[PDB]
Amino acid sequence: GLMQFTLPVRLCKEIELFHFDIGPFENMWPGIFVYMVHRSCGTSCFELEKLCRFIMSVKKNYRRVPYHNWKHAVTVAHCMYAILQNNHTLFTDLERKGLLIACLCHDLDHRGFSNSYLQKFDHPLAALYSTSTMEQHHFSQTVSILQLEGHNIFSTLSSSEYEQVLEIIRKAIIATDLALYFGNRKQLEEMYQTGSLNLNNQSHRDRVIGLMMTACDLCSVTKLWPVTKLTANDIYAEFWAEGDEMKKLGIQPIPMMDRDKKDEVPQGQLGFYNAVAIPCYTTLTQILPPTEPLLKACRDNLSQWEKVIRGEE
Ligand SMILES: Cc1oc(-c2ccccc2)nc1CCNC(=O)Nc1ccnn1-c1ccccc1
Ligand SMILES: [Mg+2]
Ligand SMILES: [Zn+2]
C-alpha cells in the first residue's frame, strides 16, 4: 500500500523521456515496469503480489530470441508509459491499466518468425489463426497467464470493466500486426484531415490506440543513434535466421531476410523509415501533439542511415 518503487536518480529522470533505454540489467526491468504502472495508473490499480506474479509469468513465457524477447516487451511498455504520461487527461482509468499490460504481453511466446514463415512452414498456429497468426496467439497467451491462480491482476474490476479491459488488450495486441497498420494509419490520416476524427467515437479511439501500439512497437527507431543501430543487429539476426529457414523450405527469401544481401541493409532501413516509421509518427503527432519527440528522434535516425549510405559512417 505505502510501498513505492523508486529508481536511481538518472533513471527516475530519463524514464520520463521517450528515448529512454531500459539498460542491460535484466533484474531491474520488472521494477522499472512496476514503477511505470504506479506513476501511470496509481499504487491502487493492481495488488502488488498479483502484479509481481503476473510480470514473472509473462517474463517466463518470452523466449531467448535475439529481438522478440523480454527486453522488447518492457521497451514497448515504456514507450506506451511515455505517450500516456504526456497525454494525461485523454485516456480513461481502464485504458492506462489495459495498454501497459497489452504492451508487456504483445509478443508473448514469439519464436522470432513472421506470420508469412508460419504460413509457408504450415505451422499449426497458421491453421488455428488464418490472419494475424502470432498476434492472436500472443493474446491467447495473455488470457492463459491471467487465468493462472493468483495471477488475475484485474480481479477487483466489475464484470463489465473486466470485459472492457480484455477487449482493449485484444484490439491493442492484434493492432501490433504491421500488415494491419497501413490501412489503420491511412483511415486515421483521412479522418484527421477531413476533420471527422472524434475521440468520443469508440471505433475512432480503437484506431488511435492501434496507431499508439504500432508507434510503441517500432520505438527502436526513436532511440538515440547508438541504441537504434545496435537494436538493428538483433532485428536482422532474426530476419536472417528466418531467411535461412525459407531456403531450407526451398524458397528464396525476400532480400531483407537474406544474410548474403547484408550490403543492402542501409537502403532497406531508408525504405522502412520512409514507408512505415515516418508516416506512423507523423500521424501520431497530428492526433497527439505531445508525441512529437518520437517523430523528431525518428527523423534524426533517418538522417543517420542516410549518412551510413554516403560512407560518412
Ligand atoms: C522494409 C525493409 O527492407 C529491408 C532490407 C534490408 C536489407 C536488404 C534489403 C532490404 N529492410 C527493411 C526494414 C527492416 N525492418 C525493420 O527495421 N523493422 C523494425 C524496426 C523497428 N522495429 N521493427 C520490426 C518490425 C516488425 C518485425 C520486426 C521488427
Ligand atoms: Mg509482434
Ligand atoms: Zn513487438
Swiss-Prot record:
Plays a role in signal transduction by regulating the intracellular concentration of cyclic nucleotides. Can hydrolyze both cAMP and cGMP, but has higher affinity for cAMP and is more efficient with cAMP as substrate. May play a critical role in regulating cAMP and cGMP levels in the striatum, a region of the brain that contributes to the control of movement and cognition. Disulfide bonds: none annotated. Abundant in the putamen and caudate nucleus regions of brain and testis, moderately expressed in the thyroid gland, pituitary gland, thalamus and cerebellum. Coiled coil: none annotated. The tandem GAF domains bind cAMP, and regulate enzyme activity. The binding of cAMP stimulates enzyme activity. Composed of a C-terminal catalytic domain containing two divalent metal sites and an N-terminal regulatory domain which contains one cyclic nucleotide-binding region. It is linked to Dyskinesia, limb and orofacial, infantile-onset: An autosomal recessive, early-onset hyperkinetic movement disorder characterized by axial hypotonia, dyskinesia of the limbs and trunk, orofacial dyskinesia, drooling, and dysarthria. The severity of the hyperkinesis is variable. Striatal degeneration, autosomal dominant 2: An autosomal dominant disorder characterized by striatal degeneration and dysfunction of basal ganglia, resulting in hyperkinesis. 3',5'-cyclic AMP binds at H68, Q269. A divalent metal cation 2 binds at D107. Residues 1-312 form the PDEase domain. The lineage of its organism: Eukaryota, Metazoa, Chordata, Craniata, Vertebrata. A divalent metal cation 1 binds at H72, H106, D107, D217. The chain holds residues 724 to 1036 of 1055 of the full protein. The active site is at H68. This is cAMP and cAMP-inhibited cGMP 3',5'-cyclic phosphodiesterase 10A.
